[PDB]
Amino acid sequence: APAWTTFRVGLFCGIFIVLNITLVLAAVFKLETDRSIWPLIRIYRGGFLLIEFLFLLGINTYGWRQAGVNHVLIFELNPRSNLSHQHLFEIAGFLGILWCLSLLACFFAPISVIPTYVYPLALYGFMVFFLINPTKTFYYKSRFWLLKLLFRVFTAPFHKVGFADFWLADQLNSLSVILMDLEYMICFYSLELKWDESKGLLPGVRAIVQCIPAWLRFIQCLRRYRDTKRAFPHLVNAGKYSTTFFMVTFAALYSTHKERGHSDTMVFFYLWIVFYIISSCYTLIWDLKMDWGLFDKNAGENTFLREEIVYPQKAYYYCAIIEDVILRFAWTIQISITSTTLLPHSGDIIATVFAPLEVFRRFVWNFFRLENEHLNNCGEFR
Amino acid sequence: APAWTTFRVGLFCGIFIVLNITLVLAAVFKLETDRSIWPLIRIYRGGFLLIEFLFLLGINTYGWRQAGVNHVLIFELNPRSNLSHQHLFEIAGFLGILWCLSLLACFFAPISVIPTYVYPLALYGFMVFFLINPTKTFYYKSRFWLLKLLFRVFTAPFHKVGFADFWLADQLNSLSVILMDLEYMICFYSLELKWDESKGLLPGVRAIVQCIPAWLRFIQCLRRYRDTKRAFPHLVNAGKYSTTFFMVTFAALYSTHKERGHSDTMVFFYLWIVFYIISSCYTLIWDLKMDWGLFDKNAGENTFLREEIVYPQKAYYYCAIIEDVILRFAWTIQISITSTTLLPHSGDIIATVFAPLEVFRRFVWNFFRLENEHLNNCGEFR
Ligand SMILES: CCCCCCCCCCCCCCCCCC(=O)OC[C@H](COP(=O)([O-])OCC[N+](C)(C)C)OC(=O)CCCCCCCCCCCCCCCCC
Ligand SMILES: CCCCCCCCCCCCCCCCCC(=O)OC[C@H](COP(=O)([O-])OCC[N+](C)(C)C)OC(=O)CCCCCCCCCCCCCCCCC
Ligand SMILES: CCCCCCCCCCCCCCCCCC(=O)OC[C@H](COP(=O)([O-])OCC[N+](C)(C)C)OC(=O)CCCCCCCCCCCCCCCCC
Ligand SMILES: CCCCCCCCCCCCCCCCCC(=O)OC[C@H](COP(=O)([O-])OCC[N+](C)(C)C)OC(=O)CCCCCCCCCCCCCCCCC
Numbered sequence: 096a097p098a099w100t101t102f103r104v105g106l107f108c109g110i111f112i113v114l115n116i117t118l119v120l121a122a123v124f125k126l127e128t129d130r131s132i133w134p135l136i137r138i139y140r141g142g143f144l145l146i147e148f149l150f151l152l153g154i155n156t157y158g159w160r161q162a163g164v165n166h167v168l169i170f171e172l173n174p175r176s177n178l179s180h181q182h183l184f185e186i187a188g189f190l191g192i193l194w195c196l197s198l199l200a201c202f203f204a205p206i207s208v209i210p211t212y213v214y215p216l217a218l219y220g221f222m223v224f225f226l227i228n229p230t231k232t233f234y235y236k237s238r239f240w241l242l243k244l245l246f247r248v249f250t251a252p253f254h255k256v257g258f259a260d261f262w263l264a265d266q267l268n269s270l271s272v273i274l275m276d277l278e279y280m281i282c283f284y285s286l287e288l289k290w291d292e293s294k295g296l297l298p299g300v301r302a303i304v305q306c307i308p309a310w311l312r313f314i315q316c317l318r319r320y321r322d323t324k325r326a327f328p329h330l331v332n333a334g335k336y337s338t339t340f341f342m343v344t345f346a347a348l349y350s351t352h353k354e355r356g357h358s359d360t361m362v363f364f365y366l367w368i369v370f371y372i373i374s375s376c377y378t379l380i381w382d383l384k385m386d387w388g389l390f391d392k393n394a395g396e397n398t399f400l401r402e403e404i405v406y407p408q409k410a411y412y413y414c415a416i417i418e419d420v421i422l423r424f425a426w427t428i429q430i431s432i433t434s435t436t437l438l439p440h441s442g443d444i445i446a447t448v449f450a451p452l453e454v455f456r457r458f459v460w461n462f463f464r465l466e467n468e469h470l471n472n473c474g475e476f477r
Numbered sequence: 478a479p480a481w482t483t484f485r486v487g488l489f490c491g492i493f494i495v496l497n498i499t500l501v502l503a504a505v506f507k508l509e510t511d512r513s514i515w516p517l518i519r520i521y522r523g524g525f526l527l528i529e530f531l532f533l534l535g536i537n538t539y540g541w542r543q544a545g546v547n548h549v550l551i552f553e554l555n556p557r558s559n560l561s562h563q564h565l566f567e568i569a570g571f572l573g574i575l576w577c578l579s580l581l582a583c584f585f586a587p588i589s590v591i592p593t594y595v596y597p598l599a600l601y602g603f604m605v606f607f608l609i610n611p612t613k614t615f616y617y618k619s620r621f622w623l624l625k626l627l628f629r630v631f632t633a634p635f636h637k638v639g640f641a642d643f644w645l646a647d648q649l650n651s652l653s654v655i656l657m658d659l660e661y662m663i664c665f666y667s668l669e670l671k672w673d674e675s676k677g678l679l680p681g682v683r684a685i686v687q688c689i690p691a692w693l694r695f696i697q698c699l700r701r702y703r704d705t706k707r708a709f710p711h712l713v714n715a716g717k718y719s720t721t722f723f724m725v726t727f728a729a730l731y732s733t734h735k736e737r738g739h740s741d742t743m744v745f746f747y748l749w750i751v752f753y754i755i756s757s758c759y760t761l762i763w764d765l766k767m768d769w770g771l772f773d774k775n776a777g778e779n780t781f782l783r784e785e786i787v788y789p790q791k792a793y794y795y796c797a798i799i800e801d802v803i804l805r806f807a808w809t810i811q812i813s814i815t816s817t818t819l820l821p822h823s824g825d826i827i828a829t830v831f832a833p834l835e836v837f838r839r840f841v842w843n844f845f846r847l848e849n850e851h852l853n854n855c856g857e858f859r
Binding site: 111114 | 485490
């Protein structure tokens with residue numbers, strides 16, 4: 096990597112560190128001390144999740160490069176113009192600097208007479224303008240590749256599913272909090288704030304939006320089954336993704352019936368609980384048996400792992416396995432809380448804590464999914 | 478060159494940038510109108526000048542390496558473990574971070590039980606301990622070399638004068654504001670300081686200290702004349718450095734008069750003006766003709782410059798000549814003002830704005846001095 100790239104990575108990291116310390120101090124001492132904080136870190140939560148995801152994805156790229164996993168060939172990339180982990184760190188640091196500046200501007204109202212609620216819009220809009228910038232200036236190859244991939248993923252059944260499409264769609268499952276926060280931002284900027292006072296910091300559709308990434312992966316799996324006509328690897332995981340639909344709709348029904356105090360609430364509660372188990376198991380086993388390929392028959396000397404191990408220490412696997420089992424359930428509940436009103440008290444704390452943990456779980460999942468895809472042609476993308 | 482070195486350089490740069498911005502913002506939006514901040518400025522000015530000197534010296538190292546000026550040969554350094562400009566940037570960034578943290582602690586008092594007069598002491602003690610660290614960590618080779626060179630410089634007439642000794646003595650001649658500020662800090666922390674309050678302040682020997690680097694250079698060139706038995710250029714250089722003694726003693730006599738009313742103020746003022754012109758012209762002509770080697774009639778198309786030039790543009794040399802004239806006169810006036818009390822108003826402002834300018838003048842001087850050392854073997858160090 097170029098020396099200036101490493102310098103910019105370090106510069107962005109240092110600015111981000113100092114701005115995080117300043118942000119913590121300003122929040123502790125001089126935020127409002129009485130008004131509220133929740134509407135602020137629910138708009139900024141999605142941006143923070145995106146920055147964290149980019150940083151962890153740079154870590155993933157470094158791990159794949161060191162371990163010998165050919166993620167360039169798996170993602171169908173040219174081995175001469177791809178992004179290193181340095182560039183991912185650089186993008187994450189720059190976006191984190193913008194996020195910290197926007198949040199500090201929200202904290203420090205007397206900066207100007209400009210309303211506070213325009214600061215989030217200046218951030219996310221910039222994140223759009225950076226992404227869809229057609230001037231061929233900043234990471235134009237990678238940005239155009241990502242835009243094409245997003246178009247293919249969101250128009251899911253009408254395109255052949257390569258590894259990149261499935262990977263991005265399955266990672267949108269971990270980033271669904273971003274979509275929920277976008278919906279919340281639309282609702283807040285349509286019906287909540289006053290648009291004339293500094294009320295950015297205050298003194299049904301949601302359930303359907305929660306299942307959008309699961310819907311994309313479900314229709315992708317249906318398309319894969321249609322193309323390949325293999326019932327086992329392409330319909331079992333379709334049911335795995337549909338368990339998310341069932342859990343979300345049962346949680347929504349429970350919340351709606353409990354809002355009116357109906358007698359059917361219980362007859363739904365247990366149902367949701369059952370699916371809360373099934374989904375949590377259905378996604379978990381696929382993570383450990385199909386995504387990662389562990390618990391193989393020909394384990395050999397390695398215990399509970401496969402015959403071939405790419406990463407230097409097998410211990411990295413075992414904790415990861417535990418981590419997955421710990422966080423998969425933590426993911427599942429994090430959905431039901433976010434898409435419904437299951438916990439009118441708390442809930443925001445639970446989602447705000449579990450969403451970074453879900454991104455971390457996806458980050459850990461990437462290592463071994465790519466390791467499996469490299470060693471054995473799992474997913475059958477050739 | 479190592480990637481982590483560049484990362485740390487960038488990290489310290491970013492931290493230093495954000496800390497400077499927060500520092501100026503605090504200075505604008507903190508402090509007390511009644512209480513002055515001049516002792517604080519005069520205490521931290523030396524550290525700021527040292528950090529600026531290290532940054533500009535890293536720039537000098539980069540310029541020498543790019544231009545082919547073999548500074549390792551003339552400095553008599555080890556060609557296998559010499560310091561790079563990245564490491565100088567690293568040291569400058571780390572020391573700047575510490576300097577900014579101590580200045581912020583003086584501004585934003587973090588602990589009410591810790592008085593705001595140990596932070597300057599803590600910063601300078603940390604600098605001293607970093608320099609004289611006996612363990613083989615944190616640039617131990619370079620620090621030991623610098624300590625040995627400083628010992629040789631401050632015991633000048635007893636060691637054979639190599640290039641490094643003379644160069645470091647000239648750097649001290651440009652940095653004598655650091656010695657003046659250290660003397661002022663010693664006097665302040667012994668005579669004028671209310672140790673019973675947590676605030677940093679309340680709402681003859683100096684002239685001798687002013688001539689320490691000039692005396693070191695004078696005895697160095699006298700030693701060189703004694704060793705080589707050549708009147709030119711060593712005795713001429715000795716006279717050049719003694720012009721500083723004459724200027725300082727006449728400024729001191731002028732300041733002693735005009736307050737005790739001895740009616741001999743005008744003659745001392747005239748003598749000080751004469752020796753101000755003499756010292757400025759002497760040093761400027763030595764820089765242009767002897768240090769840099771310019772104005773050589775054995776040149777070609779290079780008007781007013783030498784025959785052979787290693788820096789890419791000839792405009793650099795003309796800009797250097799203009800800035801050298803201006804900053805030589807500025808250095809002379811500020812070295813006269815700092816050593817005395819001839820300006821009841823301003824003076825501190827003029828010294829504070831001229832000391833970094835003298836550091837910058839020495840930074841520009843290093844380029845062409847080492848260009849002439851590398852090309853025509855000036856100084857005759859062989
Ligand atoms: C004392 C600090 C403790 C950790 C800091 C606390 C933060 C949390 C933990 C962070 C861990 C960071 C590890 C990254 C992986 C290291 C990669 C590496 O060593 O590469 C070698 C690279 C060089 O690799 P290379 O390209 O030479 O590859 C090696 C090739 N061989 C082996 C052939 C020689 O080193 C570097 O140049 C430095 C990499 C950058 C350091 C990572 C920090 C980036 C920060 C980004 C800004 C923040 C974004 C926002 C974050 C939001 C998060 C919520
Ligand atoms: C409406 C919102 C929908 C949801 C969007 C959620 C985020 C989607 C993007 C996240 C994934 C980004 C990286 C995935 C690709 C990783 C694969 C890989 O290793 O390759 C490196 C990838 C691709 O590079 P590459 O190395 O594959 O390129 C190889 C070269 N060619 C093209 C020739 C093959 O790197 C990138 O994608 C970097 C480009 C910038 C990425 C981030 C830019 C800012 C993102 C902001 C999102 C929009 C704003 C959101 C806020 C809400 C707005 C309403
Ligand atoms: C935004 C506008 C820019 C200016 C902002 C204000 C700063 C003032 C001007 C700064 C000029 C910086 C020039 C440095 C030389 C460039 C080196 C180079 O080209 O090599 C690339 C180097 C790598 O060099 P390299 O070894 O690859 O050499 C290049 C030659 N090749 C490629 C053939 C081998 O990349 C870097 O890591 C960048 C250098 C560091 C960045 C410089 C800033 C350091 C600041 C230190 C911290 C603070 C110190 C105190 C502040 C001073 C005041 C008190
Ligand atoms: C009593 C007053 C004293 C005033 C002293 C004023 C400062 C003196 C030091 C400034 C110059 C330092 C660098 C000059 C040499 C550069 C030459 C070169 O290019 O080679 C690289 C040189 C040599 O590196 P090298 O690795 O090539 O070493 C030579 C190789 N061997 C040893 C193997 C032969 O690098 C250095 O000298 C860098 C070492 C660290 C420099 C900074 C350390 C901190 C300084 C703190 C000073 C004290 C604080 C005072 C605070 C105020 C008062 C309280």
